[PDB]
Design a binder for this molecule. Structure first.
Ligand SMILES: Cn1cc(-n2cnc3c(NCc4nc5cc(Cl)c(Cl)cc5[nH]4)nc(N4CCOCC4)nc32)cn1
Lengths: 248, 827, 335, 248
């Protein structure tokens, strides 16, 4: 019916980028660069948050089938955001995205677009649609983070601090391969799980089963704690690596 | 755009209705015969019928009844058309000037309503208080016969019984009472309602409902002496009036379905009846006057009088003469004798009115190999089946009739053998011997030589269906008929339950022998879509018919045609092209499947016009390079096709089941491949007739001398009502001239019932109504030579004639008389 | 699981194009047969040649919306194919894409306009039940077909009905969201709110269109037939009553309420002019053809109607098409 | 194995004669005329009664497969009697039967025999044998009328009056289609049933089961009174049409 868009962590060592000589650190860097590029460009254009993530997920899935060396990262990222705009019904003209790209890219980085930046992007749309198998509908952990928080009852200010901090973790998780590792529902629970430990919150108390120590089960079934700890470990790797500190 | 011109060559001959009354004068006895678009008025004499007037109406005559309201000197006529045009007419004659007056007129169509199954019904109260119309299921329309109701305003009374079979106004009731036979899941019943003009609703009926025969057909309003009604069925005749109930079931009427009735005695003692086999009966109502002075019905009696033509409507004139109005055969005037002749028949034929009847197929052939064409048609059905040879005389038509006494289907001409090929079907009944026995001798049985297909293609494989005694079976035959003597030289009887559907005569491949080829279909009681069929090749040579080859197909061969030495045959949804090998057998080359029911086929060069049961028309081209078909263009407007024809390489002509002719053409614009594949309907025209066969040719003398004629091309067509017409194309200059005259003639010519001509010729289906375009009603243009001289000049006013390239001279009446007289020479 | 799920990688060479069958929402509809499987499919062109914004957004709507919807009464996009990309430079490929749908036997438009088919009451029940089950399914997913026509209603010989195009389909949101195209449904099936200028309309626009289809199966003729919006609003008023604040409180909100006024303030004559329709179906028709879209019934409520509640989808009951005796009509059976 | 030679009354309306335009009254007359023609001619020739009925049975069966219009009645009846003579071992020369026919027929009726009366009959023998499917052995109600009366014991004069009266009814039933409707055993019981009602005899008293009021059942099994009344109604219709009274 629908294609599978999820791999295992061990499979990332065999991406077309890895197999062409790129080291694991460079592909992860190229992914964060492309993710933040799609994030910053669409933010400058005033785009909805679902449109940003949809293009980022298109971007992440694209370089599971192709190599970063053969397709320029910033040329591909612009095409994903352009397609994501028409997909999520928040469209922008291709010339408007190119204009924003020149603002945020230096002379070296913008050279990927070649002599005709618009044509290099419009051309890549055919390969993008074929690579993503025309599976345009993509859901994101944001709607699940909100669907689960409404079922929480208690201190409104404590729950609101939990949501924004988890929402920050979802924005940061876009820079990672987590979008490909796990379904969006599990990611929304893991960011609740991480923000609960940092904020010292007992999330089980706000649920309909205040005693259910596995508070996550009432939201997403069949989720072991090993997965939640694994996702939390990946998100916090960005904070310790970069210059940003944990929200807390 | 395309521009065409249609004229009537032979007026409709089939009688759809006839009534007797006193319309012209209070003294004369009139017989009003109703054809599809023509109304003929006669005066009954002691020697026969005397014509007095014939008028044309802008509509198909559906209801025709004569009535005389309180205060009128003579009877008036009410006519309702198929397009719901209603009118009341009066005859007025001031010496030699005969004119038909429109007393009232209007259109009684309702915005919402399901057209009934049994058709439009029109009844008038015996006291002439109202006009009863059954136009839609569950609705009874009442036109009150008021002196001031000149617009024919009407109201509808809701009817619980939706499916009504027949309805009449009863006799002998104080209040207006209707009696109708309806069919519900509980069978068929007879019920009565009282109509109230004041309340505008139905009241309680006189007598209660009774369960009647499952095949109750007609209702007979018995007059005042007896009262009540008579219900005619398939096996029984029943009388219902109050508590009295009588039912006679003679074994004679069960053999064939009774279809028509007429009252002989105004007191209602005797009635005329006719069946599908042409038999004429007399329904006798025995009366027993009782010791109270009142005359109840003793019994009912039926007596066999003789054989007449298969009649659509019967009417008793006077002195024992009856007009037999037939739609499938010749109409008759018959004499009823009190004494039976030597054959036991009380009926003797007086006169015979030629009726071309149903023209199933026809071909134009130059018998006396001159340039003047003759038209040979397959006409009639059952015992009234015949061939008709029509030629232009030296202005009327001379018609020779060759009776066949069986149903003809398709005809084809083979000049190599100086003979025709005719497909025919006869009805035989399962007898006690296990086989079948024909009702009457026919051409296939009285043939000089005869043969039967000994093919084993379908063998025993098909399950052997059970046969009961008394079941009718159709036996199809191929007749070989001489072109001069029209003698049945040979008759080949096809397999059991095998129907002959298509027939062609042509040479094939490199074979010099000219063959008769028949496409057949295996018809079984499951019907649906035949799944077996045969294509048979015959050669008639030296007085003997030889079976040359047979090809088994998996469906019905609805039509075949030869082009490029190859046989193009349509089998159900498939259109196949066969090749004639050197082994005298058929070989499939390429196929096309994107059809529902490929019925009609026409060819010109490598192009193929496909007429589907629906889907309209598709253009197919045989591509000799690839060796496969390829869709060129298709008319996407859905139509129920009845006959197709190719006018030129870009224009195509078709006929719809809604009595409409249309012409599609390739748009040839914007250079888009999608626009090109879109055949655009550029001509629309409501003909009013059901076209069965289109045929290229003309019966007028055509000289190879080349001269600019206003008409280009000649296409003849035959219809169900016997009408034969002609379609031809025009230049854009001539179209605008003739179209401008039509608008001028409409303002001048007064139409019967004051029906607008533009409404009559407008394309009309049950779902869509569009104005006519691309067609010139030639019958209206040719009427310019019949209006008075002052009206001719009224048409030519401000009209500029363009014969002189230099100056656009103002048109004289003679300038238009020259033009119209030239258009009258094309037929 | 590439297989079947991988789209856009297959070429149009695998399909032999028979010809055009009709005109759809965005392009002309084509018929073809798969070389490998032999199945007849309906194709739709994409035509990405216009480099203004690349792939058409109206096509992106139909790909996203139709791939989410799966039902027995909705035509599901089988796959998506492209032209041959023969150059090694994906920049030189200007080829278009094709949408592959499942092919059905006939369409309500072709059947009714030709006049061959006849619908009994049980056939209309089978038609409306499948039609409303599919419409309620899509309305539950917050989608509007916006183009309910007889040409977009497909039927196979078994008796199953399916909806076709969805090219003009958008998403519905109770929050005003985006103002939409006021004229979107064929004028004969256009709701009264759409004639008066409602740009943000409710899902009741498809309920009204199907209501005109329900009555068209009983009369064999379209209900409202007009060439202009004012003439169309007039015919709707002659049957359902003139739009007035009495039966339609929010009729004042519509822009063209004062602009497009009917000839008279007609009374509702729907039950009178449709008296021949069974009471179970007439009750359904009256609710579907209610002027006020807030008072007009929904797709779910029609399935809870005395006409459709107890209809069973196991009895397909295909519309009976006359056969063989139709070859020569107006014979034998005369009067 | 053996062919079926019995139809129903309802089937007689579809004989080949009926379907060619002949009315039911005329064919019944043509059968009575042909039956007495076979009866009167063979009686003049001094033929056994079984031979007369054998030709009559051939005659009745023949016009279930053929039409009276296509085959002359008296030519066929002469051929039936000629064949019946050779079957029942009472043979006659074809010239002797033609001679007897011409004596009792007028010029018009004998004109059916054409210019050569013998050959027109001798030729029809081939068609007669094929029509009767070579089923030459025919049984008649005479032997059953006597076989059942022999088992009757009582008044010798009353039993003999029953036999002759029933025997008279058997001769009259040959003029009808009863020969084709029912087996000869039922006819022999029916003529005993009819003669019993007219003479007011209670036949059960003469049987071995004097209280078995349905006396015929020990003779012919599975015969309802409806069949006997149907046969009795048809036999008396011959007498009522010609106005003649019961023999008695
Ligand atoms: C967007 N979308 C469409 C489909 N879809 C699937 N099946 C058909 C189908 N099949 C019956 C059918 N009717 C025919 C009429 C003719 Cl004249 C011919 Cl030649 C062949 C025919 N076949 N028809 C149609 N249309 C009907 C008319 O106009 C537009 C589309 N759409 C179809 C699936 N998604």
């Amino acid at each position: 019916t629908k294609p599978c868009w999820y791999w295992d962590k061990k499979d990332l060592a065999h991406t077309p980028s890895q197999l062409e000589g790129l080291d694991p650190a460079t592909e992860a860097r190229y992914r964060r660069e492309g993710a933040r590029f799609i994030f910053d460009v669409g933010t400058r254009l005033g785009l909805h948050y679902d449109t940003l993530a949809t293009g980022i997920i298109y971007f992440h899935r694209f370089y599971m089938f192709h190599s970063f060396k053969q397709f320029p990262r910033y040329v591909t990222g612009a095409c994903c955001l352009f397609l994501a705009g028409k997909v999520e019904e928040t469209p922008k003209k291709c010339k408007d995205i190119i204009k924003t790209a020149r603002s945020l890219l230096n002379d070296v980085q913008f050279g990927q677009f070649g002599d005709d930046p618009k044509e290099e992007v419009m051309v890549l749309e055919r390969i993008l649609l074929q690579t993503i198998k025309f599976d345009l509908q993509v859901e994101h952990p944001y709607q699940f983070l909100l669907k689960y928080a409404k079922q929480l009852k208690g201190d409104k200010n404590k729950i609101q601090k939990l949501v924004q901090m988890a929402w920050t973790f979802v924005n940061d998780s876009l820079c990672t391969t987590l979008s490909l590792q796990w379904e969006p529902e599990i990611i929304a629970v893991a960011v609740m799980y991480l923000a609960g430990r940092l904020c010292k919150f007992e999330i089980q108390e706000w649920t309909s089963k205040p005693m259910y120590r596995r508070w996550w089960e009432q939201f997403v079934q069949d989720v072991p704690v090993d997965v939640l700890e694994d996702i939390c470990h990946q998100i916090l790797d960005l904070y310790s690596q970069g210059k940003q500190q944990m929200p807390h | 755009m395309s521009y065409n011109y249609v004229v009537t060559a032979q007026k409709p001959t089939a009688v759809n209705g006839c009534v007797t009354g006193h319309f012209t004068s209070a003294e004369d006895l009139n017989l009003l015969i109703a054809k599809n678009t023509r109304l003929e008025i006669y005066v009954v004499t002691a020697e026969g019928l005397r014509p007095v007037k014939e008028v044309g109406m802008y509509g198909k005559i559906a209801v025709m009844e004569l009535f005389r309201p309180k205060g009128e000197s003579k009877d008036l006529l009410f006519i309702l058309t198929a397009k719901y045009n209603a009118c009341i007419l009066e005859y007025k004659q001031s010496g030699e000037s005969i004119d038909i007056i429109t007393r009232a007129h209007g259109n009684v169509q309702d915005r919402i309503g399901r057209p009934s199954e049994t058709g439009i019904i029109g009844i008038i109260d015996p006291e002439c208080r109202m006009i009863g119309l059954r136009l839609y299921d569950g609705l009874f329309k009442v036109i009150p016969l008021d002196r001031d109701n000149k617009e024919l305003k009407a109201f509808n009374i809701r009817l619980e019984e939706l499916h009504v079979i027949d309805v009449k106004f009863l006799y002998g009731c104080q209040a207006p009472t209707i009696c109708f036979v309806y069919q519900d899941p509980q069978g068929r019943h007879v019920k009565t309602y009282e109509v109230s003009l004041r309340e505008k609703e139905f009241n309680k009926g006189p007598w209660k409902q009774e369960n009647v025969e499952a095949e109750a057909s007609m209702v007979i309003a018995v007059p005042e002496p007896f009262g009540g009604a008579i219900i005619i069925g398939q096996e029984s005749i029943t009388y219902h009036n109050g508590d009295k109930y009588l039912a006679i079931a003679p074994p004679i009427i069960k053999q064939s379905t009774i279809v028509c009735h007429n009252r002989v005695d105004p007191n209602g003692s005797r009635y005329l009846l006719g069946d599908m086999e042409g038999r004429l009966f007399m329904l006798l109502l025995e009366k027993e006057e009782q010791m109270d002075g009142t005359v109840t019905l003793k019994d009912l009696r039926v007596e066999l009088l003789g054989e007449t033509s298969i009649a659509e409507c019967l009417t008793y004139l006077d002195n024992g003469v009856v007009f037999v109005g037939s739609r499938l055969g010749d109409s008759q005037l018959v004499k009823l004798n009190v004494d039976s002749n030597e054959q036991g028949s009380y009926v003797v034929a007086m006169e015979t009115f030629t009726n071309l009847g149903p023209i199933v197929d026809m071909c134009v052939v130059d018998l006396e190999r001159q340039g003047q064409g003759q038209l040979v048609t397959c006409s009639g059905a059952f015992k009234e089946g015949s061939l008709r040879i029509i030629r232009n005389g030296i202005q009327k038509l001379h018609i020779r009739t060759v009776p066949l006494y069986e149903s003809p289907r398709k005809i084809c001409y083979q000049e190599v053998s100086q003979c025709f090929g005719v497909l025919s079907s006869r009805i035989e009944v399962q007898d006690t011997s296990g086989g079948t026995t024909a009702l009457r001798p026919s051409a296939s049985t009285q043939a000089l030589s005869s043969s039967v297909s000994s093919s084993k293609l379908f063998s025993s494989s098909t399950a052997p269906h059970e046969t009961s005694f008394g079941e009718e079976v159709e036996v199809h035959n191929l007749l070989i008929i001489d072109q001069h003597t029209f003698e049945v030289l040979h008759a080949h009887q096809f397999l059991q339950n095998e129907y002959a559907l298509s027939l062609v005569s042509c040479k094939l491949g490199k074979d010099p022998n000219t063959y008769f080829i028949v496409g057949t279909a295996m018809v079984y009681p499951e019907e649906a879509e035949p799944k077996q069929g045969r294509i048979v090749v015959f050669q008639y040579s030296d007085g003997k018919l030889q079976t040359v080859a047979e090809k088994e197909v998996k469906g019905a061969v609805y039509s075949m045609v030869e082009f490029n030495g190859k046989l193009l045959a349509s089998i159900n949804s498939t259109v196949r092209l066969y090749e004639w090998t050197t082994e005298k057998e058929l070989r499939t080359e390429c196929n096309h499947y994107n059809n529902i029911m490929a019925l009609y086929l026409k060819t010109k060069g490598d192009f193929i016009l496909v007429g589907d049961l629906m889907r309209s028309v598709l253009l197919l081209a045989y591509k000799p390079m690839e060796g496969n078909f390829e869709e060129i263009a298709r008319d996407f407007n859905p139509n129920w096709m009845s006959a197709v024809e190719i006018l030129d390489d870009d224009n195509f002509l078709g006929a719809e089941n809604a009595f409409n002719l249309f012409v599609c053409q390739k748009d040839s614009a914007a250079t888009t491949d999608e626009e090109r594949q879109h055949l655009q309907e550029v001509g629309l025209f409501h003909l009013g007739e059901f076209v069965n066969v289109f045929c290229h040719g003309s019966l007028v003398m055509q000289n190879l001398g080349e001269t600019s004629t206003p008409t280009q091309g000649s296409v003849l067509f035959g219809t169900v009502n016997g009408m034969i017409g002609l379609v031809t194309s025009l230049s854009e200059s001539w179209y605008n001239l003739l179209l401008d005259m039509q608008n001028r003639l409409n303002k001048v010519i007064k139409s019967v019932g004051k029906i607008e001509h533009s409404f009559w010729r407008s394309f009309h289906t049950e779902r869509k109504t569009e104005p006519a375009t691309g067609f010139i009603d030639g019958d209206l243009i040719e009427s310019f030579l019949d209006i008075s001289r002052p009206k001719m000049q009224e048409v030519v006013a401000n009209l500029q004639y363009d014969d002189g390239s230099g100056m656009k001279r103002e048109a004289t009446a003679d300038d238009l008389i020259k033009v119209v007289e030239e258009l009258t020479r094309i037929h | 699981g590439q297989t079947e799920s991988d789209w856009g990688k297959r070429c149009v060479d695998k399909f032999d194009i028979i010809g055009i069958i009709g005109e759809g929402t965005y392009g002309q509809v084509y018929k073809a047969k798969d070389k490998d499987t032999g199945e007849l499919v309906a194709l739709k062109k994409v035509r990405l040649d216009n480099e203004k914004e690349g792939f058409p957004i109206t096509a992106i709507r139909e790909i996203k919306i139709l791939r989410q919807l799966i039902h027995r009464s909705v035509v599901n996009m089988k796959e998506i194919v492209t032209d041959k990309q023969d150059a090694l430079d994906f920049k030189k490929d200007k080829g278009a894409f094709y949408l592959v749908f499942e092919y059905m036997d006939h369409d309500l438009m072709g059947l009714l306009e030709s006049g061959l088919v006849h619908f009994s009451e049980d056939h209309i029940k089978s038609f409306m039940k499948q039609l409303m089950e599919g419409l309620e399914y899509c309305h539950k997913k917050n989608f509007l077909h916006r183009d309910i026509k007889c040409s977009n209603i497909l039927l196979n010989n078994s008796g199953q009905i399916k909806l076709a195009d969805f090219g003009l389909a958008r998403l519905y949101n109770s929050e005003e969201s985006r103002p939409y195209t006021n004229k979107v449904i064929t004028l004969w099936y256009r709701p009264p709110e759409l004639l008066l200028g409602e740009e943000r309309y409710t899902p009741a626009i498809d309920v009204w269109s199907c209501g005109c289809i329900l009555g068209e199966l009983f009369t064999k003729k379209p209900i409202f037939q007009a060439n202009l919006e004012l003439a169309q609003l007039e015919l709707i008023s002659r049957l359902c009553g003139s739009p007035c604040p009495a039966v339609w409180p929010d009729v004042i909100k519509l822009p063209y309420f004062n602009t497009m006024k009917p000839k008279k303030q007609y009374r509702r004559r729907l039950r009178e002019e449709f008296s021949f329709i069974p009471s179970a179906a007439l009750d359904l028709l009256d609710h579907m053809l209610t002027l006020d879209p807030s008072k007009r019934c929904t797709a779910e409520q029609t399935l809870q109607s005395d006409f459709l509640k107890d209809v069973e989808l196991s009895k397909m009951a295909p519309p009976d098409l006359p056969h063989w005796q139709d070859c020569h009509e107006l014979w034998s059976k005369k009067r």
